[PDB]
Amino acid sequence: QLNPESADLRALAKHLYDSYIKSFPLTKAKARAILTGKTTDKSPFVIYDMNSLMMGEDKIKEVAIRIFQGCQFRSVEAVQEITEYAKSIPGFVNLDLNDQVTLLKYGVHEIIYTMLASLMNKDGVLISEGQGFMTREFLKSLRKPFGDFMEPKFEFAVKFNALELDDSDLAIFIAVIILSGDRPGLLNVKPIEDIQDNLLQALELQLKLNHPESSQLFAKLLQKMTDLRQIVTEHVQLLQVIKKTETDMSLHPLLQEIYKDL
Amino acid sequence: ESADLRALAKHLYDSYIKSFPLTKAKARAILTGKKSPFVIYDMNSLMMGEDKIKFKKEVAIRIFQGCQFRSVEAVQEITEYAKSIPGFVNLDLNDQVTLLKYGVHEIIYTMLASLMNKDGVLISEGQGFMTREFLKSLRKPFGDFMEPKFEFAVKFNALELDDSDLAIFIAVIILSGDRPGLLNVKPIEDIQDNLLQALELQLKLNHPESSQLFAKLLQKMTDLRQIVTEHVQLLQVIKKTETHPLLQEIY
Ligand SMILES: COc1ccc2c(c1)c(CC(=O)O)c(C)n2C(=O)c1ccc(Cl)cc1
Ligand SMILES: COc1ccc2c(c1)c(CC(=O)O)c(C)n2C(=O)c1ccc(Cl)cc1
Ligand SMILES: COc1ccc2c(c1)c(CC(=O)O)c(C)n2C(=O)c1ccc(Cl)cc1
């Protein structure tokens, strides 16, 4: 049943889950509760058009660019949360400082899209800490350059969410993503792969115990990692179109460094 | 199932051995040193190997075209192999075509790695060895079409997989249920599910040593698809060169 090796893996899964809850205010469990059905101030105000958007700004704490800026800041914040979480991953802070930067530089967006799926269903996405919900249709109808940014995330989210992972699963998966080893520019790949192998072992057991009847969930989840890369690249090219189409459009420095020479 | 997975593994290996002329074991012997292949390291050596070895104006272009000739050949070998995978033939015909159309490229690079090392690649069934430098020394954008494969190969070969491993991995690549246009994704995923179990057992029995090799191999699929997207890119750019009708059709 349980053994010395298996026991260390469960301890790691728990540590990671506990750190995950402490680092990310809006978990998938909370997201799903708001999306499925409640009464408490859990019910989100829905934005599906210009007027409703107008209304949401009064109920929630051109539009194309206003949505852009809001989504832009939330990513900066997400980077901060992910960065905080990364430090809790055993051995991560002990690695060469440059590699810590490299790992974050490349894992941050893959993680952002992974967790964003937790806030999405086929019809829309929770915003402003769960207070609002912006429909998929509204986002897809935005001015040419802007109405093409979210669909690819929704397409991914609908399929990824089909795996039915919960937060304890995601906590370990997110750690695996960060501690890659095949990221461009890494100095000491060995120590990084040793940590990842251990996280992989933890994720494998975690999925088997939490999802007994889900055959090869582990392999299916790992394959999803390719969907994430695709999302990142595609997103980058779309970002380049924006930089040129809206010379009056900014872009937070933090995000700008992540994308530099990516 | 313990035994049902090994039967599947053995079956794929046997079929893979029969569908693919040059195996990794075969190529490895030839690559490290175990008939010394003709080496193409520069222009004159190529020219010599052409009439001396006999393969099948402007070198960069002819080399690029030879890559296509071999790719098309490989496709038939892969198609035949795909047909030996249990369940494949019973799938909707259009899906089979969809799965092959999107999978051959991934498989081509996977297998191409078996014939590469950090210094070059084995050509024309091991008879030759085109050097990595000669390839990188090609002009226009041609001196950069093989390099990404080498970099992928270098990383992929580090897993030290053997033919029996690759046989199952290649079947997994073919039965990808996320290919665009599929009409009945279920059977495809049910087969890949069965193949993934077989691949997992195979890697644990064949390499007790390397921890999480199964997971590491699957992560390599991220790399593969990038090599492909990237390859499709260069191919379109190449579509901007002046320097048949029936051949252009075949390819
Ligand atoms: C998945 O990408 C998005 C897209 C739109 C977003 C957000 C995130 C967040 C943040 C979040 O969801 O956590 C908010 C608040 N969005 C807004 O709709 C918005 C609307 C008007 C203004 Cl002025 C500013 C922001
Ligand atoms: C959670 O995933 C996303 C999705 C879209 C994003 C971003 C992050 C970031 C932040 C980043 O990429 O670091 C920017 C700047 N996005 C946009 O360009 C954008 C354009 C138009 C609209 Cl309507 C909404 C968003
Ligand atoms: C699985 O599909 C392929 C695709 C391309 C290939 C090969 C196999 C092999 C392996 C083989 O042919 O045995 C080689 C050597 N490829 C070349 O890059 C190449 C380049 C220039 C010329 Cl002129 C000829 C071949």
PDB file of N, CA, C and O in Angstrom, chain A residues 95-119:
ATOM      1  N   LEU A  95      18.975  26.836  -6.763  1.00  0.00           N
ATOM      2  CA  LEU A  95      19.596  26.766  -8.077  1.00  0.00           C
ATOM      3  C   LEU A  95      20.289  28.081  -8.403  1.00  0.00           C
ATOM      4  O   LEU A  95      20.068  29.096  -7.739  1.00  0.00           O
ATOM      5  N   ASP A  96      21.121  28.043  -9.438  1.00  0.00           N
ATOM      6  CA  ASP A  96      21.824  29.225  -9.900  1.00  0.00           C
ATOM      7  C   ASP A  96      20.769  30.298 -10.129  1.00  0.00           C
ATOM      8  O   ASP A  96      19.709  30.037 -10.697  1.00  0.00           O
ATOM      9  N   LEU A  97      21.065  31.508  -9.679  1.00  0.00           N
ATOM     10  CA  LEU A  97      20.132  32.613  -9.808  1.00  0.00           C
ATOM     11  C   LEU A  97      19.681  32.869 -11.245  1.00  0.00           C
ATOM     12  O   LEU A  97      18.507  33.158 -11.495  1.00  0.00           O
ATOM     13  N   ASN A  98      20.604  32.753 -12.193  1.00  0.00           N
ATOM     14  CA  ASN A  98      20.273  32.988 -13.592  1.00  0.00           C
ATOM     15  C   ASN A  98      19.243  31.981 -14.109  1.00  0.00           C
ATOM     16  O   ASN A  98      18.349  32.325 -14.884  1.00  0.00           O
ATOM     17  N   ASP A  99      19.383  30.736 -13.673  1.00  0.00           N
ATOM     18  CA  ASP A  99      18.465  29.686 -14.072  1.00  0.00           C
ATOM     19  C   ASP A  99      17.079  29.920 -13.467  1.00  0.00           C
ATOM     20  O   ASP A  99      16.065  29.580 -14.082  1.00  0.00           O
ATOM     21  N   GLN A 100      17.033  30.502 -12.269  1.00  0.00           N
ATOM     22  CA  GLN A 100      15.751  30.789 -11.629  1.00  0.00           C
ATOM     23  C   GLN A 100      15.025  31.771 -12.547  1.00  0.00           C
ATOM     24  O   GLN A 100      13.844  31.618 -12.826  1.00  0.00           O
ATOM     25  N   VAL A 101      15.756  32.773 -13.025  1.00  0.00           N
ATOM     26  CA  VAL A 101      15.187  33.770 -13.922  1.00  0.00           C
ATOM     27  C   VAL A 101      14.751  33.122 -15.233  1.00  0.00           C
ATOM     28  O   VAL A 101      13.653  33.374 -15.722  1.00  0.00           O
ATOM     29  N   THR A 102      15.609  32.289 -15.802  1.00  0.00           N
ATOM     30  CA  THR A 102      15.274  31.617 -17.053  1.00  0.00           C
ATOM     31  C   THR A 102      14.017  30.753 -16.909  1.00  0.00           C
ATOM     32  O   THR A 102      13.091  30.861 -17.713  1.00  0.00           O
ATOM     33  N   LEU A 103      13.983  29.907 -15.887  1.00  0.00           N
ATOM     34  CA  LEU A 103      12.824  29.044 -15.648  1.00  0.00           C
ATOM     35  C   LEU A 103      11.525  29.841 -15.521  1.00  0.00           C
ATOM     36  O   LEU A 103      10.491  29.445 -16.058  1.00  0.00           O
ATOM     37  N   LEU A 104      11.575  30.961 -14.806  1.00  0.00           N
ATOM     38  CA  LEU A 104      10.388  31.789 -14.648  1.00  0.00           C
ATOM     39  C   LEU A 104      10.031  32.453 -15.966  1.00  0.00           C
ATOM     40  O   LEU A 104       8.878  32.463 -16.379  1.00  0.00           O
ATOM     41  N   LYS A 105      11.035  32.995 -16.634  1.00  0.00           N
ATOM     42  CA  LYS A 105      10.829  33.662 -17.915  1.00  0.00           C
ATOM     43  C   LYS A 105      10.047  32.780 -18.900  1.00  0.00           C
ATOM     44  O   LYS A 105       9.178  33.266 -19.625  1.00  0.00           O
ATOM     45  N   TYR A 106      10.349  31.482 -18.908  1.00  0.00           N
ATOM     46  CA  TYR A 106       9.694  30.549 -19.824  1.00  0.00           C
ATOM     47  C   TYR A 106       8.499  29.784 -19.288  1.00  0.00           C
ATOM     48  O   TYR A 106       7.694  29.288 -20.073  1.00  0.00           O
ATOM     49  N   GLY A 107       8.375  29.658 -17.971  1.00  0.00           N
ATOM     50  CA  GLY A 107       7.250  28.899 -17.441  1.00  0.00           C
ATOM     51  C   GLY A 107       6.025  29.708 -17.061  1.00  0.00           C
ATOM     52  O   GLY A 107       4.903  29.191 -17.011  1.00  0.00           O
ATOM     53  N   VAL A 108       6.241  30.993 -16.810  1.00  0.00           N
ATOM     54  CA  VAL A 108       5.177  31.890 -16.387  1.00  0.00           C
ATOM     55  C   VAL A 108       3.924  31.918 -17.262  1.00  0.00           C
ATOM     56  O   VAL A 108       2.816  31.777 -16.751  1.00  0.00           O
ATOM     57  N   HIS A 109       4.066  32.083 -18.567  1.00  0.00           N
ATOM     58  CA  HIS A 109       2.866  32.103 -19.393  1.00  0.00           C
ATOM     59  C   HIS A 109       2.226  30.735 -19.560  1.00  0.00           C
ATOM     60  O   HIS A 109       1.001  30.631 -19.610  1.00  0.00           O
ATOM     61  N   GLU A 110       3.032  29.683 -19.636  1.00  0.00           N
ATOM     62  CA  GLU A 110       2.461  28.340 -19.752  1.00  0.00           C
ATOM     63  C   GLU A 110       1.584  28.080 -18.515  1.00  0.00           C
ATOM     64  O   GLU A 110       0.522  27.461 -18.598  1.00  0.00           O
ATOM     65  N   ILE A 111       2.024  28.588 -17.370  1.00  0.00           N
ATOM     66  CA  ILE A 111       1.268  28.421 -16.142  1.00  0.00           C
ATOM     67  C   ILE A 111       0.026  29.318 -16.139  1.00  0.00           C
ATOM     68  O   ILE A 111      -1.055  28.892 -15.738  1.00  0.00           O
ATOM     69  N   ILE A 112       0.178  30.551 -16.617  1.00  0.00           N
ATOM     70  CA  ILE A 112      -0.938  31.480 -16.646  1.00  0.00           C
ATOM     71  C   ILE A 112      -2.100  30.906 -17.445  1.00  0.00           C
ATOM     72  O   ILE A 112      -3.239  30.952 -16.998  1.00  0.00           O
ATOM     73  N   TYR A 113      -1.819  30.365 -18.624  1.00  0.00           N
ATOM     74  CA  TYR A 113      -2.869  29.766 -19.454  1.00  0.00           C
ATOM     75  C   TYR A 113      -3.444  28.506 -18.794  1.00  0.00           C
ATOM     76  O   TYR A 113      -4.631  28.221 -18.917  1.00  0.00           O
ATOM     77  N   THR A 114      -2.600  27.764 -18.079  1.00  0.00           N
ATOM     78  CA  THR A 114      -3.059  26.560 -17.398  1.00  0.00           C
ATOM     79  C   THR A 114      -4.104  26.934 -16.346  1.00  0.00           C
ATOM     80  O   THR A 114      -5.187  26.361 -16.301  1.00  0.00           O
ATOM     81  N   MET A 115      -3.777  27.918 -15.521  1.00  0.00           N
ATOM     82  CA  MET A 115      -4.661  28.353 -14.453  1.00  0.00           C
ATOM     83  C   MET A 115      -5.861  29.160 -14.944  1.00  0.00           C
ATOM     84  O   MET A 115      -6.935  29.115 -14.335  1.00  0.00           O
ATOM     85  N   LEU A 116      -5.682  29.882 -16.045  1.00  0.00           N
ATOM     86  CA  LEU A 116      -6.764  30.658 -16.621  1.00  0.00           C
ATOM     87  C   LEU A 116      -7.914  29.721 -16.997  1.00  0.00           C
ATOM     88  O   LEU A 116      -9.086  30.097 -16.899  1.00  0.00           O
ATOM     89  N   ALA A 117      -7.584  28.500 -17.424  1.00  0.00           N
ATOM     90  CA  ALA A 117      -8.616  27.528 -17.792  1.00  0.00           C
ATOM     91  C   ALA A 117      -9.524  27.287 -16.594  1.00  0.00           C
ATOM     92  O   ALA A 117     -10.703  26.983 -16.758  1.00  0.00           O
ATOM     93  N   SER A 118      -8.977  27.425 -15.387  1.00  0.00           N
ATOM     94  CA  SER A 118      -9.768  27.218 -14.176  1.00  0.00           C
ATOM     95  C   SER A 118     -10.863  28.260 -14.063  1.00  0.00           C
ATOM     96  O   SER A 118     -11.878  28.031 -13.402  1.00  0.00           O
ATOM     97  N   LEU A 119     -10.652  29.406 -14.703  1.00  0.00           N
ATOM     98  CA  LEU A 119     -11.615  30.494 -14.640  1.00  0.00           C
ATOM     99  C   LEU A 119     -12.519  30.543 -15.858  1.00  0.00           C
ATOM    100  O   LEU A 119     -13.322  31.468 -15.987  1.00  0.00           O
TER     101      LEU A 119
END
